[PDB]
Design a protein around this ligand. Structure first.
Ligand SMILES: NC(=O)c1ccc[n+]([C@@H]2O[C@H](COP(=O)([O-])OP(=O)(O)OC[C@H]3O[C@@H](n4cnc5c(N)ncnc54)[C@H](O)[C@@H]3O)[C@@H](O)[C@H]2O)c1
Ligand SMILES: Nc1ncnc2c1ncn2[C@@H]1O[C@H](CO)[C@@H](O)[C@H]1O
Ligand SMILES: [Cl-]
Ligand SMILES: [Cl-]
Ligand SMILES: [Cl-]
Ligand SMILES: [Cl-]
Ligand SMILES: [Cl-]
Ligand SMILES: [Cl-]
Ligand SMILES: [Cl-]
Ligand SMILES: [Cl-]
Ligand SMILES: [Cl-]
Ligand SMILES: [Cl-]
Ligand SMILES: [Cl-]
Ligand SMILES: [Cl-]
Lengths: 488, 494, 494, 493
């Protein structure tokens, strides 16, 4: 496909308006445009992006374009796209987009595959990823081509509708496999052909980084990678403060009830859980925390929160928010013990945290649409119901518009810097000898730079060290100011 | 009009779903239905309501209906109606509704007038008014009193009064759109029947007023001896002012800002003008998500309260150029002027949470010479001045942002406010016989008792799993109160 | 007793230093001194005070002195006196003081009686009483009323009444130490002069009551027609109840706990019994340092307020075995019983912040069969039950922890409370002539006006750099108030 | 030989507080229960330089129950709790040299005494400790400076001139701490010029408790001057994220409430430094209604403060209007005399960073014609002669939480001290690998994440925390062991 696939081009005007307003606070991206718009450090680069296509993301895409790159983009979640944002990008020819709000799981993988396809067929030079789906289709595509040549037929794991243990494959796996199968019939050298020109990936979130580290250990990582999620100016701000506002927005839109005085269980008290808890407390809720890490559990106590095992609180709590990045944290057996009209939502990257499949396929269960992406499930034996927000997917992006511009600018300034780093290192990626790669992070020098670029947004005034002071604490006047192990 | 005027009847199904979910937390109204649905304490009563037609309001209307009343309803703001809620009411024949989201100011007054019009049960042909009124902001009460004034002035000179035909006030300034459109309706009614409004007085037994601003208008009429019917101040029940006004807004304001303002609130300087019941709640919510609240206030006691909560207290002039967002919660007039807005910084957001659009000089802004306006989104406008080229974003034309850009307060707290409403309506209706107009031309404003105020609270304890302690005989005697209450003096401030 | 009784006069220098520092924030008292030191509105008045003798109280006493009054003072609690503050007053001859930290209950009543005793200015040999009383808790008011009762009963049978000699109450139970020691003083005074107390009535013009508990005792006397002098309820001024009671305790409780309890508050389950003016503040402070507050309450309205602030509301029975710390703020009796304390866990801390030691059954605990007690530190005792071998730590024998283990509320907020006191004393004194005892005559309890309540707040705005906004003529008219106030209705709850 | 303390009769009150404190110090209670029989530290001589509080008494008791002989001194002239010191000497747990309100001269004599041990083989001779528990780096400093002084003594065969002078290399007066330390080093060169180097033979390591002391250790490591192995206890997650932050949240307030008579609500309080400590200080101050203004040099920390609703300014722009100033930088000359002269009447100034350098106290006390008066125990009001304005300083610019109050509470100190005991056990168990016949560089290391999580587990029951346990599938999905560790080494919590 050389032209874009979006919902409505006429929404472009509203998108450009929001983009300009958003830029007031996205000073990091505005500075990169101002500074590098003439020198074009990314000239000639082909960038494919798999990341929530929001207004904030449009400014990221615009920044990459102003720096000389050609762009192809898709969203990393079926409900997160903002149609007016997508329209703005195609209206100005900044990028070729394959994204719309409320995609089917089938269309999600077709869009991702389209975004990965470039014309003279070849692939991208760089990848901006959030969740690891773009990275996954690449690696699984290479595996599928190896297995295809070995037996000279379509591999049986792609045609079966079951996994290795007899259980149904997830819809995401079936739809991806379906795309990989269609591509083996067109060209069985497609994916391995892309490797010649791939110079790296920037990964945005915790869950995607986990998938990258697993590949690194096993020696299966096929391109350089930069962990953007673990920059201080991303994990300590986006993950925490972003969700503090973003979760509330999502709950206010999907849940009609008052949060004050309710017992709200936050499962997981990591970077995201901490923020969720702050916001919920901020509007009068009584947060109960669930956690497996004894250090994180103690942190929750120190902030005045009760720490319990879900089993002891499931019958009495009013709302459940999963923020673990784990699997089967809320089971169907848990949901049956919940009380009438208990709300369930997820803010971790995938829909595995809540057993949504088990709930939808429960024998004789009744489901009704309460509103746009909010469903009420009623069990036949007890006659009790539970309300699920946007089928267990990211509520902050599914029921609302995700994090606001200021924090996304910090996350995206890191992305641009990561893309520039990977591109500037092209020459060192020699595949005639080195087919195996590692995950690295951006330096603390750049991490502090990202923070400096956003100080004027909030009228912050930094103090400057004197020569003597700098020497006393043993740091340079211009930084960095802390050790690599410092936790902020 | 004997049939309803709404946006879309097919949205009724979604409305009934939200109503059932909302009822999980609205235990006060659910209890009143359970208790009085058989005895019908309001049987035969004709109730007209002028109050934001939200899902929460649908449950209020349903409660009044289950208690035997016939209902006619309209919204008290052009942007607050939830079309699916309105559809649910007409779908089940609970009430006759005249309301839709995004009404014109002209249609607002026509809807209110329609809601006030009833067909005479004796002679299905003639016109009469309601027996009771549920009001929020005082507009239903205003059209009644101004209608009576207009009829007095009509008979005196035997012609349409000149104050209704002019488009200017007593000083040469343009009348507000709300006054022109109301006057236009009063004029049309003088041509149909010049005894319409005074005719309604025979059967009017009272009004329940929901908000601070409407109560102010009632107290002014009481002092001047111009109040034409009994009134109950629902806003000053402890279970309304200390919960709805404060905790309702804590959530409700944030919802409105999140929907209308795309920016992050954390670290921003947000000015909350007015630190009363509403301002206090607004400040709590804003702080809750990391904002730096600056407070403006005229009351030295309220100003000190703000300091004790860690907030800076300043005059708007000293903070207008640096602050990022402005929230008016004063119940006053011209708190944000055009001269203030010109000194604001690029893309500063302005919003109002007090009952009317007077707090911000919206008329002055829209009519500023050579100003450019553009719609950022549904009910959000960006105004750009021609000389400085700087812009300000206004949320829903300076009207209630919590109801204009969002869905207002959540069910739990509205159930507390509405349980008071039902009790007020039952009180006014039960006192009918004492309202003798052949002699008593003087009416007053009263409040519900503390006994009932505590009752409202008891009805909602199970929603949040609250467990009350019960006094022993000795304890009750020691603190000099009954085991069953009331537990505090009338002057207690909670 | 011409001369004072205090612990150590050499501590006077430190007291005068703290007084000057405290005055930086006590702008209300500093303004009254500046304004009235020349005109002496209280010249010739004899004032007896029964109120915690802290540095803050020294500035109150100094203010009354600069306004022309002669002063005699005692503390209203055996642990609250700050010896350096008492020394400062006697060093400068501002007042005659009878107070020291760690008084015995016996000495407490002797000090109060001494403070009530004055030398007749006409005939130096004879005795008389005060003209005005500054009271906190109602003990000065109590000894007066019980003294009059004792004299009536003395003349009736011409002998010492038997209720004063017995060590038991009407049901066989031991009298409280406070009753025994007061009775012992009243008995001595009947032997010196059986017309002493009734003689004081001739010149008594009123009492200013500082706290909730004392006001309750005044209202009971008012109903029964037993109140023998005019009274002003200072506690219910907005600038007292909404600041002192709430914000004072937010800091003051923490100070007390940090000094008496060695443990960390963060993450602990702390039960606050009573969520009134004081409880609300206690909860804010505790949350502020990471505690998990659980609330007990009998009032459904107050219970709901606690929920809205994110606190769990439970009955003590359901949380007594698991909670770590217990804080009583009810103004009630037997809220923590010995049966409750036996179910508590090892080294659970128990403290009280309500005015008297009745909230916790301290007598029952100290007299429990075979119980072992040990002093952990200055005014902190650990009690160990013999059967379970478990222990509970009690802070300063169940008396005011904020004043017993720490120094009470800080200057800023006490200045607001004490500015009301001075204004109350001036009011009572200026009304002398209207107090005619040759006639019926029932006395009542009244409050200060809102005009004065706002005045108190204005006097403290500069302390925190608060900038008030001023209403325009139009704005004042729109909201129907004077530009200079008052700004709210009498029923407004702030 | 025998201890030096204020009053032995206060011992009974100390033992009472120790037992109460142990209810929450479950980490130390568990170590005692577990290792009291096997005595993993048997035969070890431990010298400690750390605030002698009730909490510290439980640490000392734990080390004793594990078989060590102990000598102890405080690491600050105002932090000692006399009843705690008395308790240790009453039960013969340790030999103590500490009392509240020491003179700077006596502080260094106490530290030197604590470092002195009687040779077990030949009772006549002197030796040093095997292990050192340090907080601030003073025990580590006297050792290194003592070795330097002995090298310079033999070279020139005379007392080095830098020890006799009362001035530094630029003509400025030496700090009292340097003069008094030098005075002790000089006296020891006259008794025995091989004393300090003699201790090196048996030194197996030091556990450093605080940020500032770690900085001093890292400087020595870079320069190749570190003379013994070291463990950075301060950077364990169960120390920096709890003690530094949550400890101060309560501890600062306690100090201010005791030293400052004023109400904190509504006041503009400047917290200089928004690091681990600053964050906690700000939380507590906000908790009681103050309006916190933050000062910071780090753009990342500055942004963190904004996100919590705090204004971030340079001191110059807020010094005339702010009411209270709290230094938490670990830096030098953050509050100067020129700053204090611009402050308003009765502005309060306090420090919570480890040393008194953050505030120019020397400059203030020695200002021409200044008047000083004692407001109370360790609180002084200084009045400038030209403007007539005054500033109140809390405990001469030293740790206000420990100077005006009792420091952090037991729960968090148990977490910090459980790390200490584990560090001491680690250093002692590695003795054999410390071979000085080969002159190797010594480095600073940290405890493992396995142990860091262990410390947290030991304190879960104190607050009734209930941990969830991962299933086999879950553990595999997130790629961790069911028993941990649960996070990567770079994770910031
Ligand atoms: N009182 C206590 O009980 C206690 C407890 C723990 C640590 N400490 C001490 O507190 C100090 C700080 O500890 P930490 O762990 O927070 O250190 P940290 O590095 O975490 O924080 C120090 C902060 O100060 C900032 N800073 C440095 N110089 C500055 C200047 N001139 N102006 C503004 N900001 C400046 C740094 O950027 C940093 O954010 C250390 O001296 C440490 O020993 C004391
Ligand atoms: N408004 C937004 N636009 C784009 N990405 C977002 C937004 N809000 C959150 N995210 C990203 O989505 C990721 C989770 O999929 C987060 O780690 C975050 O970086
Ligand atoms: Cl619990
Ligand atoms: Cl490093
Ligand atoms: Cl229509
Ligand atoms: Cl200011
Ligand atoms: Cl002009
Ligand atoms: Cl005597
Ligand atoms: Cl005057
Ligand atoms: Cl519960
Ligand atoms: Cl054992
Ligand atoms: Cl030499
Ligand atoms: Cl030299
Ligand atoms: Cl500012």
């Amino acid at each position: 496909k050389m032209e874009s696939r979006i919902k409505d081009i006429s929404l472009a005007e509203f998108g450009l308006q929001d983009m300009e307003i958003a830029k007031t606070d996205m000073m990091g991206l505005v500075e990169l445009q101002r500074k590098y718009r003439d020198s074009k450090p990314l000239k000639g680069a082909r960038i494919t992006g798999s990341l929530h296509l929001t207004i904030e993301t449009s400014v990221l895409v615009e920044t990459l374009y102003e720096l000389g790159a050609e762009i192809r983009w898709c969203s990393c979640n079926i409900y997160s796209t903002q149609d007016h944002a997508a329209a703005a990008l195609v209206k100005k020819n900044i990028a070729t987009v394959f994204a719309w709000k409320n995609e089917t799981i089938e269309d999600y993988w077709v869009c991702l595959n389209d975004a990965m396809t470039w014309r003279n067929i070849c692939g991208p030079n760089l990848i901006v990823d959030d969740g690891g789906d773009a990275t996954l289709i690449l690696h699984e595509g290479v595996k599928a081509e190896i297995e295809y040549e070995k037996y000279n037929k379509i591999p049986e794991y792609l045609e079966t509708e079951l996994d290795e243990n007899g259980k149904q494959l997830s819809m995401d796996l079936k739809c991806m496999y379906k795309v990989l199968k269609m591509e083996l019939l067109k060209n069985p050298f497609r994916w391995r052909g892309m490797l010649k020109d791939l110079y790296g990936v920037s990964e945005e979130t915790t869950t995607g980084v986990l998938r990258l580290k697993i590949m690194e250990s096993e020696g299966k990582l096929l391109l350089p990678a930069i962990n953007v999620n673990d920059s201080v100016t991303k994990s300590k701000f986006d993950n925490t403060y972003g969700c503090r506002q973003s979760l509330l927005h999502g709950l206010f839109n999907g849940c009609i009830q008052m949060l004050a005085g309710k017992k709200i269980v936050v499962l997981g008290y990591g970077e995201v859980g901490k923020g969720c808890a702050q916001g919920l407390s901020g509007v009068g809720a009584r947060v109960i925390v669930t956690e497996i890490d004894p250090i994180c559990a103690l942190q929750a106590s120190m902030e005045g929160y009760q720490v319990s095992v879900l089993e002891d609180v499931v019958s009495e709590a009013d709302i459940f928010i999963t923020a673990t990045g784990n699997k089967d944290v809320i089971t169907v057996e848990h949901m049956r013990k919940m009380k009438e009209n208990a709300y369930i939502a997820n803010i971790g990257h995938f829909d595995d945290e809540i057993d949504v499949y088990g709930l939808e396929n429960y024998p004789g269960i009744k489901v009704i649409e309460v509103k746009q992406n909010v469903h009420k499930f009623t069990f036949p034996d007890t006659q009790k119901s539970v309300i699920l927000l946007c089928k267990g997917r990211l509520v902050n992006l599914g029921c609302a518009t995700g994090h606001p511009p200021l924090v996304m600018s910090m996350s995206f300034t890191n992305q641009v810097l990561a893309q520039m780093d990977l591109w500037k290192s092209r020459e060192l990626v020699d595949r005639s000898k080195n087919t195996r790669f590692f995950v690295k992070k951006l330096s603390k020098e750049l991490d502090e730079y990202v923070a400096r670029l956003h100080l004027d947004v909030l009228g912050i005034k930094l103090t400057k060290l004197t020569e003597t002071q700098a020497k006393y604490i043993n740091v340079s006047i211009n930084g960095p100011y802390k050790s690599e192990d410092y936790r902020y």
